[PDB]
């Protein structure tokens, strides 16, 4: 079936008792991105220890889940009764087998058959692909995907942009504005390692007639070098239109006083992230 | 126009939101779907009873929730911070902010997805008399053996006619057997053989339990075999009163089963064969 | 200068090469060979502005998802970090090259003239088999059960003796239908013995010797087939046909009796269930003569 | 012609027929070698594979002859026997006599086309200066201020236009290894950084210039000028100086004078730098 919600699969002639010498395979097919749940309402077959005579063989996704026979209530039989039988993919193969004689080991017997009811269900693509394993490239999502019926769609963590493929995310970190009186500014995902290949302009614009006070916090960790300062990563600071220092390293830079109402912290990263980053408190005073 | 999924962000996300705003969003999914609305990010101006600034969840007329404050997800295995599930196909979300923000507040980021309503289980009232079937986007009812579903698409009813037995050796039982027989019903089963044969009915003395007779001995519920001029019955009580092997001397037999409104019991089962 | 999906080899040069390169310049050229190829490349001429740690000018070559090299300087000089001629191979089919140069190429404060570089790149075939990521391949199945083959561009698969390749060209079934035996003596064993036998089989092990001989079947130990003490051979069956007619359907743990056929044509039919727990069977068939 | 292929014994993997002689002609395109390998080998065993055999012939010569019962010893490899050839075609001939003592399943083999790395795979390299391999062929390249000759194989120097700035480079006489032109003066100039010394190497055998007169004065001459210092004039068959020469100068002028007649093969050299 190309597209179907639910359905019924019965033994032949149901409810009328089933004919002997019969084996038929019916295959349930829900559309792409759905699982197949099913249960039995009525179940009345020829019982046999190990189901030699008659049986219902239900198999899903290259594995036989069940081969079951007997009556709903009777022992010495392996009946499903009402148990859930879910597939993983979108296909569930059912088979029904019956020899020539169901009416011998006692005397005449009248066996009705079975009522299979099957629902479609949605599968959780996220928890399927990302639960364990999988280091090679697969179609799985970077920051978070979403599980909804049928398909799945993706989204990124606060302050990141989704790229065209709708699977991965870069940082935006271009027009990061700050107009409040005090505040905190931190490199993206602090104190975890900062993303590489960035052009950040953390802009502070307070009401004119104030002076800004920049207080760097610990830790302050950026890839530096003892020969030349800031070759890979740079944290430039512009104040009042002009640069006032390009910083990188391990000890925090000095607490800076600007005499300005407009500052811009420019952040340039390399193509690797080992160091953690930086965080600062900016406060306002009067002139 | 209705969708199965969607995104709702605070204005200017993930920057600071503007003051003196009242923005509303109307969530809508198709018929017979519930809604799961969950928040991936929450940083809003904190006030008691979320007075100053707030994000509001209203279903119909009633307030399903109201959030404010600075909050992040405690579980590292899940991004969800707050969440709601509703049995309705529409929702409303209202974000409002007063004229000032003392600190910088990034707002909120949330998403919604449409879920199937399992009409059988999700409600206390089940809309099927006998058996309920859920499917993605709706439901429909079903019935036990030799029951037929009534016009209202909801409740079922028993038939016990239309079946003519032509087999030489066969079985007959009361409806629902071994469960109790239905009340206020007349069940007639008919056997039709070749002229030369006799229908002989066997039923186990223990496989018979029908509502007992009154003090005077008249069966309030009864079972009776009609063979042309001869008639066997009425039979009732716990245990079959007749012999385990009964000869009707007839090739065509009508078995009638009468029940009143209350006073039901297990029922009966039988098997018949032929004799020249 | 030659990035193109369908191309074997190519040239990538510094700008204006051979003429010395302009200051204040950074350009990224990406090499792309077709699917299933690696990218090898080397430098013939190499003359850049040197700098301790290549702060000033550099050539940044990066592979699949990793920067392999960032190199600068002149072919011979020990002023640091020239590739010279060294091999730089990618894993996938794409190789990203970049060339960066600041404003000042004139050190000590007098003019200097730096030519650039000559990059030559070959395509190469990759060994899909030898990759060997045994798990973490559910979207593709790039590795084969019995054997795959490495050839240029693509790869194809094949099965061990006596198996058939099924549609996916990745996995194998058993053939085990027309298994013939015409020699005088011989050995016949269930597939992959004494390991567990495959399920879902219809085997016809046919013996046809020259007429005027009689066959002697001697079963060996072990003899292990899924049986049942109530009714014998419900799941698995090993039927034996002799001279056109069945002469016994066997299964169990103790071996069947040594059989003497009085026939020149026997057929052992083997029917398996849909699981393999038991091991199988093995037999020696020998020939005797008549007058 | 294909890039890959499969060859099986007749009736594989059953017993092969007797009195057979089957042949297969393998063919790959130009500039590819062939890797032919056997995954299964079970053939009637005879000394020098007399009775039954599988035969590998490339062109006119027998690359191999196999028989016997053999399986792969390496559990990490299915290959039992294998062959690699620098040729684009092969022949495989399987032949069997009229009897088999036991049942022999034959053989199963496969072939794949490999690129010839024309630079490395042969001892003779078809490029005078630099060789470039690619999948399916090759092409040549040259050192600084050399221009490649019409034959697409050997490179050549021009007498003028060249200022040498490379730290390690080559210089040759014009037309080399063909005879040098008459009545010409070719001066080549090397200009390095001041801190370096030009050190000139040229092979004792890579030098043949018109010999000197009886008095020992070179009629054609080659000479190195380093400011005040001067090496030469050199002439005759074979370089008279040492194979490794130190000039002690960062700028060097090499002058090559010839008269009207009496020409010879010429010379070739390569120079590098050394600090002071
Ligand atoms: C297991 O594998 C064996 C393999 O041998 C297989 O046995 C073979 O079964 C087939 C079944 O048909 C036999 O084939 C033919 O049988 C014909 C019988 O005809 C009657 O039955 C038909 C239905 O089966 C029906 O439609 C007809 O109307 C009729 O009622 C018979 O006519 C026919 O005779 C020819 O025999 C051979 C081919 O087998 C011909 O050629 C000869 O072949 C031999 C090699 O075997 C040799 O090369 C000779 O030189 C060559 O001439 C010949 O000319 C006759 O015309 C044919 O026999 C096979 O006989 C039989 N093989 C045997 C017994 O050795 C089993 O069935 C398999 N079991 C399974 C799969 O479960
Ligand atoms: C980081 O991000 C900030 C903001 O996001 C950028 O700042 C903007 O860009 C420049 C640099 O600060 C500013 O442009 C300058 O504006 C001055 C006056 O400001 C007003 O003018 C512009 C144009 O009318 C308005 O659009 C703007 O909103 C302001 O209201 C001018 O004085 C400057 O003009 C020229 O002055 C002299 C001439 O006398 C020249 O010598 C100068 O070179 C200059 O060209 C100039 O126009 C702009 O105002 C900033 N704010 C905005 C756009 O809102 C940073 O540039 C950015 N930094 C990095 C490294 O990315
Ligand atoms: C069950 O036994 C009976 C007789 O063989 C049949 O059931 C019949 O089912 C139909 C609906 O498909 C019912 O029809 C309706 O009857 C009412 C009578 O009041 C009439 O007003 C409507 O217009 C409509 O025709 C019918 O009542 C019902 N008969 C019964 C219950 O005796 C049927 O053959 C058998 N099987 C099934 C599945 O019903
Ligand atoms: C070594 O010396 C030769 C001397 O012949 C130099 O060759 C010069 O090459 C230029 C090309 O750059 C020739 O120009 C010609 O242009 C036409 C029209 O486009 C083109 O069809 C020709 O094929 C050729 O390229 C030029 O004639 C030639 N110079 C002289 C004086 O003849 C060069 O320095 C060195 N050799 C080569 C092959 O470059
Ligand atoms: C059916 O056969 C089994 C074993 O053959 C036996 O236990 C049972 O009594 C038989 N009769 C029935 C179930 O009526
Ligand atoms: C000139 O070059 C020398 C090289 O040793 C260097 O020490 C000096 O600083 C250079 N001159 C200037 C002005 O940089
Ligand atoms: Ca049966
Ligand atoms: Ca889904
Ligand atoms: Ca870094
Ligand atoms: Ca506010
Ligand atoms: Ca529903
Ligand atoms: Ca009653
Ligand atoms: Ca520069
Ligand atoms: Ca390949
Ligand atoms: Ca088995
Ligand atoms: Ca032979
Ligand atoms: Ca080649
Ligand atoms: Ca001369
Ligand atoms: Na960080
Ligand atoms: Na916001
Ligand atoms: Na009942
Ligand atoms: Na086996
Ligand atoms: Na063979
Ligand atoms: Na010469």
What is the distance of C-alpha D180 from the center of its chain? 26
C66 and C131 in a common domain: no
Report cis status (omega within 30 of 0) of the bond before D233: yes
C137 and C121 in a common domain: no
Residue A242 CB contacts under 8 Å (≥ 6 apart), including other chains:
none
CATH superfamily of D158-275: Spermadhesin, CUB domain (2.60.120.290)
- Give domain status of residue C85, yes or no: yes
Residue C18 CB contacts under 8 Å (≥ 6 apart), including other chains:
C45, C115, C116
- Cα B154 from Cα B136, distance rounded (Å): 18
Residue B175 CB contacts under 8 Å (≥ 6 apart), including other chains:
B145, B146, B158, B160, B181, B182, B185, B187, B267
SS (H, E, C) D103-147: CCCEEEEEEEEEECCCCCCCCCCCCCCEEEEECCEEEEECCCCEE
| DSSP helix/strand/coil, C86 | coil
- CA separation, residue B175 to residues B163, B187, B188 (Å): 13, 9, 11
What residues flank ligand 2, with Cβ below 6 Å? Answer: A 175, 201, 203, 241, 264, 266
CATH number of the domain that residue C76 is part of:
2.60.120.290
CA angle at C37 for the pair C36 and C43, rounded to the nearest 5°:
165
Report cis status (omega within 30 of 0) of the bond before A134: no
- Give domain status of residue A113, yes or no: yes
- CA separation, residue C190 to residues A278, B274, C204, C220, C233 (Å): 69, 53, 11, 12, 17
- Cα C217 from Cα C225, distance rounded (Å): 18
- Give domain status of residue C2, yes or no: no
- Cα A200 from Cα A29, distance rounded (Å): 51
CB D232, CB D221: distance < 8 Å: yes
Would you say the CB of residue D158 lies under 6 angstroms from ligand 4? Answer: yes
Closest CA to D173 of D190, D164, D185, D191: D185
CA angle at B164 for the pair B162 and B167, rounded to the nearest 5°:
155
- Cα A239 from Cα A245, distance rounded (Å): 9
Beta partners for B38?
B83, B111
- Cα D236 from Cα B34, distance rounded (Å): 101
CB neighbours of residue C278 within 10 Å: 23
Residue that is last in its domain, among A122, A142, A163: A122
Closest CA to C180 of D103, A192, D44: D103
Residue A128 CB contacts under 8 Å (≥ 6 apart), including other chains:
none
CB A217, CB A274: distance < 8 Å: no
Closest CA to A98 of A10, A23, A26: A23
Beta partners for B23?
B95
- Give domain status of residue C269, yes or no: yes
Segment holding A128, helix H or strand E: helix A125-129
A160 and A188 in a common domain: no
Which residues are placed with Cβ below 5 angstroms of ligand 9, an ion? A 223, 270, 272-273
Structural class in CATH, domain D117-153: mainly beta
Residues of chain A in contact with residue C234, where contact means CB-CB under 8 angstroms, are 50, 52
What is the distance of C-alpha B205 from the center of its chain? 37
- Give domain status of residue C144, yes or no: yes
Q: What is the dihedral of CA A120, A122, A125, A127, to 10 degrees?
A: -110
> Residue D49 phi/psi, 5° resolution?
40, 60
- Cα B113 from Cα B42, distance rounded (Å): 19
Instruction: Judge whether B5-116 and B160-275 match in fold.
Output: yes
Kindly determine whether residue D15 and residue C186, on different chains, have CB atoms separated by under 8 Å: no
Length of chain B: 276
Give the minimum alpha-carbon distance from B88 to chain A in angstroms, rounded to a whole number.
Answer: 16
What are the residue ranges spanned by the domains of chain D? 4-115, 117-153, 158-275
A129 and A115 in a common domain: no
CB D215, CB D196: distance < 8 Å: no
Number of domains in chain A: 3
Would you say the CB of residue C136 lies under 6 angstroms from ligand 6? Answer: no
Task: Read off the DSSP letter of residue B231.
Answer: E
User: What is the pairing mode between strands A176-178 and A199-205?
Assistant: parallel
- Cα C119 from Cα D167, distance rounded (Å): 18
- Give domain status of residue A86, yes or no: yes
Strands (E), C50-178: 57-62, 67-71, 94-101, 117-125, 147-148, 157-158, 163-165, 172-174
For domain D4-115, the CATH architecture is Sandwich (2.60)
Beta partners for A91?
A29
Q: Work out the burial of residue D241: count CB atoms within 10 Å of its CB; fewer than 13 is exposed, 13-18 middle, 19 or more buried.
A: middle
CB C29, CB C94: distance < 8 Å: no
Would you say the CB of residue D147 lies under 6 angstroms from ligand 4? Answer: yes
- Cα C210 from Cα C290, distance rounded (Å): 12
Domain B160-275 belongs in CATH node 2.60.420.10: no
CB neighbours of residue C174 within 10 Å: 19
Which of D3, D39, D134 has its CB closest to that of C152? D3
Length of chain A: 287
> Residue B50 phi/psi, 5° resolution?
40, 60
Task: Read off the DSSP letter of residue A71.
Answer: B
Domain B5-116 belongs in CATH node 3.10.20.30: no
CB B41, CB A158: distance < 8 Å: yes
Residue A200 CB contacts under 8 Å (≥ 6 apart), including other chains:
A171, A173, A174, A176, A188, A265, A266, A267, A268
CA angle at A158 for the pair A156 and A159, rounded to the nearest 5°:
95
Q: What is the dihedral of CA C49, C55, C58, C62, to 10 degrees?
A: 170
A107 and A209 in a common domain: no
| CA neighbours closer than 13 Å in the CB half-sphere of residue B146 | 18
CB A120, CB A6: distance < 8 Å: yes
CB A248, CB A240: distance < 8 Å: no
CATH number of the domain that residue C140 is part of:
2.10.25.10
- Cα C95 from Cα C69, distance rounded (Å): 12
> Residue C12 phi/psi, 5° resolution?
-130, 120
- Give domain status of residue A96, yes or no: yes
Ligand 17 centroid – CA B36 distance (Å): 62
Give me Rg for the CA atoms of chain A: 34
- State the residue range of the domain holding C250: 179-289
Method of determination used here: X-ray
CB C158, CB C147: distance < 8 Å: yes
Residue A241 CB contacts under 8 Å (≥ 6 apart), including other chains:
A262
User: What is the pairing mode between strands D4-8 and C237-242?
Assistant: unpaired
- Sheet containing C67-71, strands listed edge to edge, beginning at the edge strand earlier in sequence: C25-32, C94-101, C57-62, C67-71
A140 and A227 in a common domain: no
Q: What is the dihedral of CA A24, A29, A34, A38, to 10 degrees?
A: -30
Would you say the CB of residue C267 lies under 6 angstroms from ligand 1? Answer: yes
| Torsion sign across C-alpha atoms C217, C218, C223, C228 | positive
Domain B118-159 belongs in CATH node 2.40.50.140: no
A143 and A93 in a common domain: no
A129 and A197 in a common domain: no
- Cα C8 from Cα D115, distance rounded (Å): 12
Give the minimum alpha-carbon distance from B142 to chain A in angstroms, rounded to a whole number.
Answer: 10
Residue that is last in its domain, among A82, A99, A122: A122
Mutate to test the interface with A, among C26, C35, C53 (most CBs of A within 10 A): C53
CB neighbours of residue C185 within 10 Å: 14
Length of chain C: 291
Q: Closest ligand 5 atom to the C-alpha of A109?
A: 14
C120 and C16 in a common domain: yes
Ligand 20 centroid – CA B95 distance (Å): 11
Query: Per-residue b/e over A23-62, b at no fewer than 16 CB within 10 Å?
Result: eeeeebbbeeebbbbbbbbbbbbbbbeebbbbbbbbbbee
- Give domain status of residue C277, yes or no: yes
Residues of chain A in contact with residue C230, where contact means CB-CB under 8 angstroms, are 49
CB B253, CB B191: distance < 8 Å: yes
Chain C CB within 8 Å of residue D241 CB: no
- Cα C256 from Cα C223, distance rounded (Å): 8
CB C97, CB C11: distance < 8 Å: no
Q: Closest ligand 3 atom to the C-alpha of B162?
A: 5
């Amino acid at each position: 079936i190309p597209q179907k919600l639910f359905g019924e699969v019965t033994s032949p002639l149901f409810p009328k008792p089933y004919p002997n010498n019969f084996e038929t395979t019916t295959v349930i097919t829900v559309p792409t991105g759905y699982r197949v749940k099913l249960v039995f309402q009525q179940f009345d077959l020829e019982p046999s220890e190990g189901c030699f005579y008659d049986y219902v063989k239900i198999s899903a996704d290259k594995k036989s889940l069940g081969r079951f026979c007997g009556q709903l209530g009777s022992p010495l039989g392996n009946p499903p009764g009402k148990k859930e039988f879910m597939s993983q993919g979108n296909k569930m193969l059912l088979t029904f087998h019956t020899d020539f004689s169901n009416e011998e080991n006692g005397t005449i017997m009248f066996y009705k058959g079975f009522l299979a009811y099957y629902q479609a269900v949605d599968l959780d693509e996220c928890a399927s692909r990302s639960k364990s394993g999988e280091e090679d490239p697969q179609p799985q999502c970077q920051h978070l995907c979403h599980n909804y019926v049928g398909g799945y769609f993706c989204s990124c963590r606060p302050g990141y942009e989704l790229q065209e493929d709708t699977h991965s995310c870069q940082a935006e970190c271009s027009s990061e504005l700050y107009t409040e009186a005090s505040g905190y500014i931190s490199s993206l995902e602090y104190p975890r390692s900062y993303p590489p290949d960035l052009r950040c302009n953390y802009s502070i614009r307070v009401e004119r007639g104030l002076t800004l006070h920049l207080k760097f916090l610990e830790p302050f960790d950026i890839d530096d070098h003892q020969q030349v300062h800031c070759p890979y990563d740079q944290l430039q600071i512009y104040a009042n239109g002009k640069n006032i220092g390009e910083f990188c390293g391990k000890q925090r830079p000095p607490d800076l006083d600007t005499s300005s109402n407009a500052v811009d912290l420019l952040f340039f990263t390399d193509e690797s992230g080992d160091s953690r980053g930086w965080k600062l408190r900016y406060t306002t005073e009067i002139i | 126009e209705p969708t199965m999924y969607g995104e709702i962000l605070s204005p200017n996300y993930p920057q600071a939101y503007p003051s003196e705003v009242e923005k509303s969003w109307d969530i809508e999914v198709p018929e017979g779907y519930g809604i799961h609305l969950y928040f991936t990010h929450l940083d809003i101006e904190l006030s008691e009873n979320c007075a100053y600034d707030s994000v509001q969840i209203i279903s119909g007329d009633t307030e399903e929730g109201r959030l404010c404050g600075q909050r992040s997800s405690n579980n590292p295995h899940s991004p969800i911070v707050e969440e709601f599930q509703v049995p309705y196909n529409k929702l409303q979300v209202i974000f409002k902010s007063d004229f000032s923000n003392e600190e910088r507040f990034t707002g909120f980021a949330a998403y919604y997805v449409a879920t199937d309503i399992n009409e059988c289980t999700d409600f206390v009232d089940v809309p099927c008399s006998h058996f309920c079937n859920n499917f993605i986007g709706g439901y429909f009812c079903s019935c036990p053996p030799e029951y037929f579903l009534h016009d209202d698409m909801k409740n079922c009813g028993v038939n016990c006619s239309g079946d003519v037995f032509t087999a030489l050796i066969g079985e007959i039982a009361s409806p629902n057997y071994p469960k109790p027989y239905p009340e206020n019903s007349r069940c007639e089963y008919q056997i039709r053989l070749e002229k030369g044969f006799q229908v002989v009915v066997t039923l186990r003395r223990e496989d018979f339990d029908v509502e007992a007779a009154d003090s005077a001995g008249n069966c309030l519920d009864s079972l009776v075999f009609v063979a042309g001029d001869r008639q066997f019955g009425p039979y009732c009580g716990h245990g079959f009163p007749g012999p385990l092997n009964i000869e009707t001397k007839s090739n065509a037999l009508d078995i009638i089963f009468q029940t009143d409104l209350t006073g039901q019991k297990k029922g009966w089962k039988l098997r018949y064969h032929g004799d020249p």
